[PDB]
Amino acid sequence: FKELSNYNIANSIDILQEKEGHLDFVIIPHYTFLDYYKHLSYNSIYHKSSTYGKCIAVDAFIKKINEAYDKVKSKCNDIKNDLIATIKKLEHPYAFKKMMDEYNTKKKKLIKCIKNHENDFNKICMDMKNYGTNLFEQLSCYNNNFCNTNGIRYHYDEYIHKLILSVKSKNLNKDLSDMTNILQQSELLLTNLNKKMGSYIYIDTIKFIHKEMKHIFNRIEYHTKIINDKTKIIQDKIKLNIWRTFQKDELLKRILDMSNEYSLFITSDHLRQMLYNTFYSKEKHLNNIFHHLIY
């Protein structure tokens, strides 16, 4: 199974502004954790056709579980949007130490406010661990030596395969490669503005936007590296886990193993897609603060 533990729950979070004004946060381990048990629950029901019908009920519970969790993280809206409008000062300052300190504070208050609800979240996540784990314990076979892996196959086909091939069709190394040129430019444009050239203003902000972008790129480097791994791992693994029988225990081991592999895979792919957006979200605001190729 997968438990939740301690972790310094400060850096176990990411704050991501897809478009200008639509900022949100993650809580990696939760998202892994919930997803982990989302797959398990499916796998559990699909293993027989006698219980494929649960899909509606499970969709139900999972729809709810997110609509529950989303409502909780809502309690941090008026503090999150306190950040948003502080960002908007940073990404549109058309003084600085104060606009920085304001960002660091309004951010830390958003962290705390999340951490505060560390236990309101756990109940949702434990309720999910419950549902997913209560099935799985229900997963019966026709013959324990010789259990059927069509369960895992259908679950791979529908929910997963679509996302693998998406990652294969998108050349994420290009994606990275490009961003590292984007930063190269920012860097070149910033080195140009440096020098004794009197001293044009805003540069502080640019520096900050760039710095921020770097940290984003480095995160995207990371989740991307994990993605490409798990792709090969998932693809290798799934081959071994279909069109065959299993011993009940080895089976259960597989599903969990996969439920794990998928979860990590998705979480990354997710954060990547969010970060990617957040990357260029800054590029626009950074590009804006230029006005044109050279004022």
């Epitope: 791992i233 290798d236 693994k237 071994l240 029988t245 299993f246 011993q247 225990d249 080895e250 081991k253 597989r254 193993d257």
Partner: antibody
Framework: EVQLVQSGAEVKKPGASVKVSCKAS????????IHWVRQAPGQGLEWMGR????????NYAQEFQGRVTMTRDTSINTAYMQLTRLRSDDTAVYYC????????????????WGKGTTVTVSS | DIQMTQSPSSLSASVGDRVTITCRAS??????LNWYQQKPGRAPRLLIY???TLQSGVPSRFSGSGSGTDFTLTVSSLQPEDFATYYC??????????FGQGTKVDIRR
């Protein structure tokens, strides 16, 4: 170096029990599965079960289901295999081995073996 | 419920011969099949794992092969020090099935 160390030969009567040990030394104990393969006199190898030192989970052949009981203590890095309801035929050499060659993610080979324990069942 | 059958159970081989030991699975098992040497009154030695990879340090005359049901262990030039009983083990399904009877390697003539 990498070493498996088993208890000394035992002798037990029809319808006693028998515990044998397997001290893992060299490597981290709870990494690799530890397995118990016995061998009748002048006979083939015979897989009995396994135990995940880490979890404590056990998988037994069905021949020994309900007779064998595998355990381990992580203070000492020792894995155990207790048979019960002993019989003439249970007379064998009990080996223990290490699935530490993971060759296909879930697929392992018994890379290290202990020299193995002579259990005699006589009366 | 995977039954591993080794052919010849017992055979006769002079030094410097090639020795090829067969091992058939009752069902398809991929390349999940390891090979063991066991000298009279010794612990089994792991030679070949995963049907045809060779365990570090093992003499390179031992060569695993085959797939699906039929597997082969091949000693290029049989040596004195190889006069053992050999065992093949399927790992495809995890009550690892009892290795097939194993094969005897005498001298000959």
């Amino acid at each position: 170096e990498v070493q498996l160390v088993q208890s000394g030969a035992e002798v037990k009567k029809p319808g006693a029990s028998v515990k044998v040990s397997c001290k893992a030394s060299g490597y981290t104990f709870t990494d690799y599965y530890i397995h118990w393969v016995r061998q009748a006199p002048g006979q083939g190898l015979e897989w009995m079960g396994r135990i995940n030192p880490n979890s404590g989970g056990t998988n037994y052949a069905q021949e020994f289901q309900g007779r064998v009981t595998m355990t381990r203590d992580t203070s000492i890095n020792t894995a155990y295999m207790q048979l019960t309801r002993l019989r003439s035929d249970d007379t064998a050499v009990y080996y223990c081995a290490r699935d530490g060659i993971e060759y296909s993610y879930y697929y392992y080979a018994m890379d290290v073996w202990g020299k193995g324990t002579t259990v005699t069942v006589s009366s | 419920d995977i039954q591993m059958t080794q052919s010849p159970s017992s055979l006769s081989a002079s030094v410097g011969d090639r020795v090829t030991i067969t091992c058939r699975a009752s069902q398809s098992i991929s390349t999940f099949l390891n090979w063991y040497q066991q000298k009279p009154g010794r612990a089994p030695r792991l030679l070949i794992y995963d049907a045809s990879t060779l365990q570090s340090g093992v003499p390179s005359r031992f060569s695993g092969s085959g797939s699906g049901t039929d597997f082969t262990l091949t000693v290029s030039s049989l040596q004195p020090e190889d006069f053992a009983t050999y065992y093949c083990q399927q790992t495809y399904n995890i009550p690892l099935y009892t290795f097939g009877q194993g094969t005897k390697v005498d001298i000959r003539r």
